[PDB]
Design a protein around this ligand. Structure first.
Ligand SMILES: [Zn+2]
Length: 30
């Protein structure tokens, strides 16, 4: 399964850490 964002913002990543970093733009950092 791909690491797809579903915020809808739906960028697909091959790396979980890259999805994590991406998600940092939604939450985790303000
Ligand atoms: Zn996103």
């Amino acid at each position: 399964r791909p690491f797809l964002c579903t915020w809808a913002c739906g960028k697909r990543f091959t790396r979980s850490d890259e999805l994590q970093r991406h998600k940092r733009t939604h939450t985790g950092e303000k």
